[PDB]
């Protein structure tokens, strides 16, 4: 979770003029930045606040109200060393499928660093004994449109001990 400064040109139709301008701007920014991943930024959650809001122009075309709004919004982007607590939403032979609680099913931990008893035989077996912890390692983003996802990240689970659960 981190704040991101953005500058957006929001278009409000004329039938929303009776509403307050700031409230409608916040609603439009939330509707435009909900469950979406900005490249090299991360998955945005919602709008945090609006810092600068300049004059509202009206163009000779559509005729709506165009406002350039400077705002700060919260996004989910670790700092390459953040510790998280997720739940195992599946498991593949090449790696377990852990998902943050109802947040995003995109965490794919590679099983190549635990103690030498690592294997997944497709029977949802996590690991042989001697709330699941997660150590983000690197971020990675990709595009979608290439003809006329985008966030997975690598997850580490070192020899943390885990006296509560093996």
């Amino acid at each position: 979770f981190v704040l991101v400064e953005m500058v957006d040109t929001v278009r409000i139709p004329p039938w929303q003029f009776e509403r307050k301008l700031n409230d409608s701007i916040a609603e439009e920014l939330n509707k435009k930045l909900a469950n979406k991943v900005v490249y090299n930024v991360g998955l945005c959650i919602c709008l945090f606040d609006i810092t600068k809001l300049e004059d509202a122009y009206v163009f000779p075309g559509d005729g709506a109200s165009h406002t350039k709004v400077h705002f700060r919004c919260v996004v989910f982007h670790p700092f390459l060393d953040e510790i998280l607590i997720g739940k195992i939403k599946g498991c593949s032979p090449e790696g377990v499928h852990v998902s943050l609680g109802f947040f995003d099913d995109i965490l794919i931990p590679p099983e190549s660093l635990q103690q030498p008893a690592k294997f997944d035989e497709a029977e949802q077996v996590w690991v042989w004994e001697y709330g699941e912890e997660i150590r983000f390692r690197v971020v990675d983003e990709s595009f979608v449109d290439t003809s006329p996802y985008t966030l997975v990240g690598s997850i580490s689970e070192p020899g943390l001990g885990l006296l509560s659960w093996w």
Binding site: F1, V2, L3, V4, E5, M6, V7, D8, D23, E27, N30, K31, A34, N35, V38, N40, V41, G42, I45, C46, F48, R72, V74, V75, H77, F79, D81, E82, I83, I85, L100, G101, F102, F103, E133, G159, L160, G161, L163
Partner: protein, 122 residues
Amino acid sequence: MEVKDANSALLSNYEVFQLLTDLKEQRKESGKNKHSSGQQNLNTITYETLKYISKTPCRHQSPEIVREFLTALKSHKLTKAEKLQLLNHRPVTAVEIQLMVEESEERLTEEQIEALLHTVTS
């Protein structure tokens, strides 16, 4: 649609929880039919993130407690990431600070851990 700074200021989970609660109450007090039907992903992401934060011990927090915790940890020369993780996780056990918290070498000193536990539990 360009961004100015993706790492402007790090914030803990308490600010996110407060923002989610405020947005939820403003939504339930100003619910619109067409605005909701236009994009329903907003309600879903807000509700699920609020539920995830509720599953965490992030509750029972206040800005005064966060300020006191920050002032207490400022005397321990720790970095911003360590105190951020300690605030977001609220470790009740010492082993969470011993092994899970990074930069453990030359930082634990086997004596400061008790003070860290007493501060995080207060």
